Design a protein around this ligand. Structure first.
Ligand code: COA
Ligand code: COA
Lengths: 417, 417
């Protein structure tokens, strides 16, 4: 019946993942999202990591559902004219091109404001405007390195490690999305748009907040009691890599289940929750550990925590990961299996919840995407195909007032060049 | 002058990180956020990982800036009365307690709706309502395991690995935040609140979208051309662990810089951007690689990509990471240093950008927090101290109509029990 953003007009001047992820969600909340793409090639994701010759890649289809596509060279005087008219009629413009790119076309925040003082301008960059790295190009892992994630992820005796999760890309997109929605609410009171910027470095940092917590702890005490280097190894000046440690106030580890020698996902994540120690003891057949002072409190457990994980793993290694969780959760233990992407892709509850979603794409047939991650009692998004390149050029030009001949003339002229 | 959410009243019925992260941002956007905490202990984070005896832990102070605290036992008939009055006057209630917890107090979505049909109810859980894991407890890494991150992060010959980034916690908080803001906009049209749910598993999955992309690629072709196992190793049924691979359409790796033998952060992230190959060649003194067909295209590079990273590392290993980036970025290469948490905590540009922020906490003095990650041209949040336990009980009760004697009587009675 109604959606949060019905009537909102969005200009999607974006590429790759960070920007497109934000705008796809805008479309899913009911906005009309017009992706503005360079003529003939469009969004780089259309052609990266193709699994079928000549059609849009999954990279593109999974990030651009529910959008309209117009082909437009904004470096041409004509492209600029159309662009200006689109900005005049739009509520939101999002861009995530390299530092300086859109300014050099002449769509500076300052100018955009003059065309449309109700427009909310959303901009993603690698880094903040006062960063020494302000003009640096950033892909996913560059941000993961700049943002403290790579330094803190992996093992103490291994290199910094990148996370599979898009900390730099979709995460940055989610963060801009928050700002854009907040600007929409703010405009309800002021009557004015504003500019919202988000850096990929800052998105990564936001998710690494508890590591800035631990840095302060470590500056003050010289050790981190729950980290694996305590009490037998060594702390340096910086928060170290912790392996599969819990990262919070509840120790845990990634434990081997049956099949691990061969199946890289034959594992669970097991949490030793402080207030569930007794149950945990009952789960693993160590009732004696309920009152033994070397085990009865977390503080007592810590110095020999790996001997505890080792005992638990003596159990988990013997059954299938799904059975281990089936058993262990009856004792109210926080655990789950390490689900592979294959398992996720076929899970019926994720289908049922609208988290993994099938979509019919022209020319390609069916694909899977991740759906709208949060669930609303008042509406449900309908996740639709991604646009073919320039599929809506004509429609979007007619909406701007261009006649059929005008449209035909601009395409012809373009073809003729 | 004005903030996005001025006038919005929020009930923060949350603990730990996922829920509190969402509500802290609400306060930073101008909402009045009332944290509702059990009498005498409050949010578990107040007492976890303390670095100073008897005062609120950094865990708490970094997640609860700008909030008011009321102590309230919502299991008592009296606690329930106050609670109901708070829900009557509030715009948003957020909760992230264990599955079943708030229902069993009698604040079921259904009832909340009857008290206040304009209230937006926000709820975080480990898993979705139709999940077989709906009643399972979830901390950070349990979600990272359930959501595909752990399966896909780390090395091919190592265990699944957790990410330092809060994929399960603050990330889930950010996602609910998006829903809550979208519900606020929706209520501007319908006059009605609604319920917004977010699972930690689904937050993790959203960030692992490109891994569901790769799962489909792999189902279709049986190999992933840009992954390290191509072409000399082996693919199984599931997307594998890739080490420090780029994760997208632009190969990369984590490279050693001078000091690595001793300093676990003496490294960069280096991207081989397809459209910058020539520059890259010039950067490393391999101009011959510009036209050599074994190197001139990405497709040609892939089968011997590690011999290329090895050559680049022959350079990076000789200088300090900061100098390596200083040099390499003049050639427009995407790279950054792996910044340690220590470096981040002291970085002047992050101070300047309001990303790392100093706050004065009563009894503790100064601490560092991560500030409001997105930047707005129309306002700037003022990041303030976190509340002491029950600091605002009296004020919040007076706002509800309770008299001074009433307040004094409820505290006395509580003390007397
Ligand atoms: C991802 C990134 C590094 C890619 O950089 P890149 O491929 O070298 O350059 P871009 O795709 O941004 O821009 C290429 C050109 O296309 C141009 N362009 C974009 N849309 C166009 C259009 N509709 N018509 C004409 N030109 C267009 C840009 O202006 C640029 O031209 P210029 O070099 O003359 O200024 C860069 O866009 C970036 O750092 N973005 C900000 C951070 C970000 O979001 N990262 C991506 C994470 S998924
Ligand atoms: C984090 C989590 C696992 C912790 O579980 P836990 O410590 O065993 O249990 P909780 O803190 O949720 O609840 C403990 C009790 O406090 C009660 N409680 C909470 N606030 C209260 C208040 N103001 N007054 C009285 N009781 C209160 C709860 O109802 C519960 O009582 P019950 O067992 O009789 O139902 C759980 O809250 C959870 O899975 N939350 C959902 C997912 C999530 O957000 N995870 C945290 C990621 S940072």
């Amino acid at each position: 019946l109604s959606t949060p953003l019905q009537g909102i007009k969005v200009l999607d001047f974006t590429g790759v993942q960070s920007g497109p992820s934000c705008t796809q969600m805008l479309a899913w909340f009911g906005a009309d999202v017009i992706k503005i793409e360079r003529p003939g090639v469009g969004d780089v994701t259309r052609h990266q990591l193709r699994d079928i010759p000549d059609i849009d890649a999954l990279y593109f289809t999974m990030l651009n559902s529910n959008k309209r596509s117009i082909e437009l060279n904004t470096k041409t005087a004509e492209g600029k004219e159309v662009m200006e008219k689109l900005i005049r009629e739009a509520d939101i413009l999002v861009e995530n091109f390299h530092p300086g790119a859109i300014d050099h076309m002449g769509f500076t925040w300052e100018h955009i404001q003059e065309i449309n003082p109700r427009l909310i301008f959303g901009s993603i960059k690698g880094f903040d405007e006062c960063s020494p790295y302000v003009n640096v190009k950033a892909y996913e892992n560059v941000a993961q390195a700049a943002g403290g994630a790579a330094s803190t992820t992996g093992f103490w005796d291994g290199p910094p490690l990148v996370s599979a999760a898009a900390l730099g890309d979709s995460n940055t997109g989610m963060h801009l999305l928050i700002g854009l929605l907040a600007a929409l609410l703010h405009r309800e009171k002021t009557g004015r748009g504003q500019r919202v910027t988000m850096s990929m470095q800052d998105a990564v940092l936001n998710l690494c907040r508890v590591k800035l917590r631990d840095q302060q702890r470590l500056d003050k005490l010289g050790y981190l009691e729950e980290y694996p280097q305590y009490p037998n190894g060594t702390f340096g000046d910086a928060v170290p890599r912790g392996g599969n440690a819990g990262g919070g106030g509840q120790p845990g580890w990634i434990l081997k289940c049956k099949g691990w020698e061969t199946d890289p996902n034959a594992y669970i994540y097991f949490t030793i929750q402080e207030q569930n120690w007794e149950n945990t003891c009952k789960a693993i057949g160590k009732p004696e550990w309920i009152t033994d002072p070397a085990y009865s409190t977390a503080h007592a457990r810590q110095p020999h925590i790996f001997d505890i994980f080792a005992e638990i793993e003596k159990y988990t290694v013997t059954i299938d990961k799904h059975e281990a969780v089936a058993y262990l959760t009856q004792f109210d233990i926080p655990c789950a299996p390490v689900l592979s992407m294959k398992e996720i892709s076929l899970d019926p509850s994720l289908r049922q919840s609208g988290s993994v979603v099938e979509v019919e794409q022209p020319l390609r047939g069916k694909y899977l995407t991740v759906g709208c991650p949060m669930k609303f009692s008042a509406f449900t998004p309908d996740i639709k195909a991604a646009p073919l390149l320039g599929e809506h050029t004509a429609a979007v030009l007619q909406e701007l007032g261009y006649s059929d001949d005008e449209i035909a003339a601009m395409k012809q002229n373009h073809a003729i060049e």
